[PDB]
Curated annotation (Swiss-Prot), chain A:
Belongs to the universal ribosomal protein uL23 family. The gene is Rpl23a. N-terminus is methylated by METTL11A/NTM1. Citrullinated by PADI4. Component of the large ribosomal subunit. The ribosome is a large ribonucleoprotein complex responsible for the synthesis of proteins in the cell. Binds a specific region on the 26S rRNA. May promote p53/TP53 degradation possibly through the stimulation of MDM2-mediated TP53 polyubiquitination. Component of the large ribosomal subunit. Interacts with LYAR and GNL2. Interacts with MDM2; this interaction may promote MDM2-mediated p53/TP53 polyubiquitination. Directly interacts (via BIB domain) with IPO5, IPO7, KPNB1 and TNPO1; these interactions are involved in RPL23A nuclear import for the assembly of ribosomal subunits. Interacts with IPO8. The N-terminal beta-like import receptor binding (BIB) domain mediates interaction with IPO5, IPO7, KPNB1 and TNPO1. This is Large ribosomal subunit protein uL23. Coiled coil: none annotated.
UniProtKB/Swiss-Prot annotation, chain B:
It is found in: Cytoplasm. GO terms for cellular component: cytoplasm; cytosol; cytosolic large ribosomal subunit; extracellular space. HAMAP family: Ribosomal_eL39 (MF_00629). Its main location: cytoplasm. This is Large ribosomal subunit protein eL39. Keywords: Cytoplasm, Ribonucleoprotein, Ribosomal protein. RNA-binding component of the large ribosomal subunit. The ribosome is a large ribonucleoprotein complex responsible for the synthesis of proteins in the cell.
UniProtKB/Swiss-Prot annotation, chain C:
Belongs to the eukaryotic ribosomal protein eL34 family. This is Large ribosomal subunit protein eL34. It comes from Mus musculus. The gene is Rpl34. The modification Phosphoserine is found at residue 11. Component of the large ribosomal subunit. The ribosome is a large ribonucleoprotein complex responsible for the synthesis of proteins in the cell. There is a cross-link at residue 107 (Glycyl lysine isopeptide (Lys-Gly) (interchain with G-Cter in SUMO2)). It comes from the Eukaryota. PANTHER family: 60S RIBOSOMAL PROTEIN L34 (PTHR46595). The keyword ATP-binding does not apply.
Length: 59, 50, 114
RNA sequence: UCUGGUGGAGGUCCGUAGCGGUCCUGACGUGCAAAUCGGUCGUCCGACCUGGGUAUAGGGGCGAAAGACUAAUCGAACCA
RNA sequence: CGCAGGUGCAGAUCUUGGUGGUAGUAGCAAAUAUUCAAACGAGAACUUUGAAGGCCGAAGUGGAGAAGGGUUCCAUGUGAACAGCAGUUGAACAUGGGUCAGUCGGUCCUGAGAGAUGGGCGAGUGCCGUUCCGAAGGGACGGGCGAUGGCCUCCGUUGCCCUCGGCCGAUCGAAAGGGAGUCGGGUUCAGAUCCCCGAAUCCGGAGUGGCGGAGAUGGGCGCCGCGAGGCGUCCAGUGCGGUAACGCGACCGAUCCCGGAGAAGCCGGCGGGAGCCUCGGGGAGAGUUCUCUUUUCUUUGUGAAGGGCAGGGCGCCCUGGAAUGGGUUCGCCCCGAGAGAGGGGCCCGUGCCUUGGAAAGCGUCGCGGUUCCGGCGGCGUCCGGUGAGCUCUCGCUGGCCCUUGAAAAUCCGGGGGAGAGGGUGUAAAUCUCGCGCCGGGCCGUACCCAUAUCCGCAGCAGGUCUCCAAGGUGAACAGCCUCUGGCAUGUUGGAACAAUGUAGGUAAGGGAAGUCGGCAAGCCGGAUCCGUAACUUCGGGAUAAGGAUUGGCUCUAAGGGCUGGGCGGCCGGCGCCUAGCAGCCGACUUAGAACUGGUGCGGACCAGGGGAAUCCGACUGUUUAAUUAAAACAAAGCAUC
RNA sequence: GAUGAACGAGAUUCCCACUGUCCCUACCUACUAUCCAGCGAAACCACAGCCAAGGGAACGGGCUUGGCGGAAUCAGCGGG
RNA sequence: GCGCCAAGCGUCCGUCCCGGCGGGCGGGCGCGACCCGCUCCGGGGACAGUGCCAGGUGGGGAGUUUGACCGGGGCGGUAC
RNA sequence: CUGGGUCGGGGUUUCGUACGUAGCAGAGCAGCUCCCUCGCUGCGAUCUAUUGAAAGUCAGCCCUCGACACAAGGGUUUGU
RNA sequence: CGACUCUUAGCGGUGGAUCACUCGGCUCGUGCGUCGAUGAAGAACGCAGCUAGCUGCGAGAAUUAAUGUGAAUUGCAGGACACAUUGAUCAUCGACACUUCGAACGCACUUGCGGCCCCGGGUUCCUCCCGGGGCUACGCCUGUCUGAGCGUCGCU
């Protein structure tokens, strides 16, 4: 995801859980040279990333 | 260097995003006078104020 | 011969950049960053040049995750004073107190007889 | 007292890296370079060389002292 | 017709812009070097692939970082402009993409220093000042006095009062100082100790005890029980072992006090460990085979964290009492303040084995599906020897100093004993022991790191802080050649070989006659064996000066380590190692000799010409960056104020 | 002030050795210069550019009087 | 060597217990550790010092000047 | 009445006896042997013969004429 | 003959003078004459479907609401507005909103570290973890509370 720069991993994990109804294992954070924050959100083993991506519409 | 502060990185981010060419449809706007981006900056030629 | 590179961004041979050579299961030689050598406690007496016995020579902050037996010797002034000077203070305390009783008795007897 | 060993001192000698810069009054001299290049040279455990961080600001600083250096500017810098 | 001016240019080394001749001229000459073929393509001296020939030659033209740069990184496309020839190419242009951390840093601590408040000064913005002219504590064992909430008999949270209490003062200051804790394998076009797999670890929290273990479960009097073993009563129990050094899995405890660690220079010499190099064999693959070579080349693992064992060290302990002094080091050094001898203890353990672990990695030989399956399978990943070898590191022990070579956060140990716990339960307070549960937020992270990503106006022979560092020759990190890795000769090519030049050589006979002057060049040069003067501050001068040798080959002599001493043992007189004998193992040199070459041999490379004097400065050191390196300055010493 | 071992990229004289410093120059090598394809400057410039004498601001390319003078160029050169 | 956070006395309590006094349990105060006296202790002192004026010294510092004529200027002369 | 090239021959000339083979030459050394010393074998710089041999020689040397292919082709101009 | 050189004219070009124009200046004059701890000026970073700069804006970001107006905006696209079951655009602007620095305000200038009181979620009054909200700067005035003083006194 691309997230707000003023957002830590706790806020990112809670948000992804709230609007997508999924469980998060861990979150990794990066700030790109563009200036925006990139979050790598690994999901729990029960949830499938491809199925979640289909429901969101990114694939 | 790799070791940089957040303030410097955000400053370099902005200069990176504003180093783009003029869009093509701007030339078609009524009463247009811009032909190219005259503020293009090359890293080797001109150095940043920082 | 394979040549090595630093695994960290410190490029200087400082006291906190010391390394050793280790051979990996991948048959490669890599740097391993080593901890500083600890020192055992020095005796509180101030006259013994050697370190104390029975106490691990580790860096001070690691000392708090060891058990108490690794940090002391089973004796009065165990992990802070050597045995030799503990012995000397037992005798020094006893003999000076003995002299004080003798002096007090001698001055009391002299006062009574004079 | 002499001899043979051992020992490893020194602002010690030859001499690398490093630091410097003698002579050719060599090269270049609208240069590679608003001071560089080659051979040859001085020193190379010490008054040694060096990074970063700190302090001293213009009639002031700093000077193993050449009026030297103080951002290609110094017998008082630069800016307005 | 009147009115009013910023009203007339050839000049001013005039100002701004534009343009000529020079001139298709100067130039595109620092660091050895390119060639053949093919591919893509309109187009190739310059791109890519392959094959040759060369270079950097590990103090690299290699692999990585710090500053600085800021997207230059990566893929695709273009060939307008730029990259001083081209270009199918680029650090150019365009379109997309790329930097993932509790355990790598920042963040925290103080250093040199910077800097508020109090105070003082100051017309004033403000300045001095950092403990100095301040009532500078806002916290806490604990106790009491009240409210409140709960798994509410009781405990906990919150206000007030006693008790304690020096901040020896805010705060800032290091991406090289201090500072707990992560390492193997795989994965990308570009990320990675950060992602995946695996195995660990530190810190914090757990109240309503998470489970165990410890504390901690004995003794006396009796009674019953055949007796064991149970019933009543009474008294213990904040652990235990070793003579000791100290040890064991825990092993209560506050204010207060003492101490330790963090936390220390430079140089030398020895020793231990590892990595690298080396030597002898065994595998697997490859090269050569015109002749030989059982050959030559490559490769031949086990992370952290635990457990055990070597090994290293010790001013640690016990017995004991030494001169006919002994022990002992390369050097030293040690002993009645306790040597030698014997027996223990501790610390470190980066080494070996082991869990991790072979399931993974690598080598090699095959079999599959399809672009990727960490596909599948077989075999292997072995046994030794050396050393003043190089590097790193751990130790021990010395030398030098009118030089003595940080601080603070942070962590620990001890002294004391204010307190707490329970009356004999299967118990309490308590536990730095074993396992179990939860969390670790913010920022940096791509790439260049320089004869093309930094500064010098640029792809500028300049400048710019570090880390790793193979073979041969040899004193060597010297120079010369080579391997791993890298490159395309440094902003162009073709042809020719004139003058003058820049750089490198040679020269008959003289031998400084040249010139201000031996400037420049040349002579000498290494090592071994001889031999060395005047003078002198006795240290030196000194490689003084002068002479001889030096190759190749074949031998000789000397210089060491281990083991043993009359099927398997052993109760034994019966043996005697004693001019140190036998066997086995091993590396590096030194000296001497014979032979031998067209007298050539430190055969390249590396590599002091010397002597007799005068002047100045004692010496080492320093100086005008960019014309003066000197006799100038400094200096120890002397003297004065 | 005088002296003085050791030292000195300090100034000087002589001697041995050695030599292209010289008599007296020559030959060889690499890179240039040269010519070509491609690229492509700058300084400088009143107009320009053959001499002798004269006079002249007393040393002329220009003026006077003589000598004379023939497109366009190349490589060198240092009198002007 | 160790040394603090009172032992010991003398009294006063309990809304506390067990037989007005006693015992137990938990507390308080005084002495131990004297009283009084106006500046914490000590050293100077109407001096030093500060503010204002006056005299001296003051190239440490500031600003400025350092004639003219002249067979070039200077020196010399004065024909100023 | 051929020609000039390219190879190849031969002459000239430079250096100084090539590789291989053989040796009863070679300072010496090791092994077998008999069971212990005749011989044989091997290592070994170098030496002797083959061998004034081998190698180079116009590219700006001399004569060939033996082999091989090639040489009547191309472009631009010039008139009393 | 040419070539070369010189001059003139025509035409063509390295060039951008002259003329004409001007949503710009300069000068004079008139009326107003208003910033900020309720956070100013000035910085920083962001915000458009395609948008770099200028401009406008602030997480509601090239704008929301309201009023007036009355059919557009426009470079392309898309869909509003049926053009009264009341509204495109523009103007005005009194409502709402207004990120981070900055006098700049919890301490410090690094996306560093706190404290007190509340709210929600994990566990349940560990306030242990995460998220959110309100406070937490200096000087100074009136009042308030709590205090100090061998300062002056009174009752004891």
């Amino acid at each position: 995801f691309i997230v707000d720069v003023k957002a830590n991993k706790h806020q990112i994990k809670q948000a992804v859980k709230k609007l997508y109804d999924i469980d998060v294992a861990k979150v990794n954070t990066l700030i790109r040279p563009d200036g925006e924050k990139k979050a790598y959100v690994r999901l729990a083993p029960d949830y499938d990333a491809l199925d979640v991506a289909n429901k969101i519409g990114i694939i | 260097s790799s070791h940089k502060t957040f303030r410097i990185k955000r400053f370099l981010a902005k200069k990176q995003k504003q180093n783009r060419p003029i869009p093509q449809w701007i030339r078609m706007k009524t009463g247009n006078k811009i032909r190219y981006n005259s503020k293009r900056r090359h890293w080797r030629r001109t150095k940043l104020g920082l | 011969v394979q040549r090595l590179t630093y695994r960290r961004r410190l490029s200087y041979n400082t006291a906190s950049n010391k390394t050793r050579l280790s051979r990996t299961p991948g048959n490669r030689i890599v740097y391993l960053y080593t901890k500083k050598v600890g020192k055992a406690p020095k005796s509180a007496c101030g006259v013994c040049p050697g370190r104390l016995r029975g106490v691990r020579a580790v860096r001070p902050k690691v000392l708090m995750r060891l058990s108490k037996t690794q940090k002391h010797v089973s004796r009065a002034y165990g992990g802070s004073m050597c045995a030799k000077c503990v012995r000397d203070r037992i005798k020094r305390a006893f003999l000076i107190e003995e002299q004080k009783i003798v002096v007090k008795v001698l001055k009391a007897q002299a006062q009574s007889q004079k």
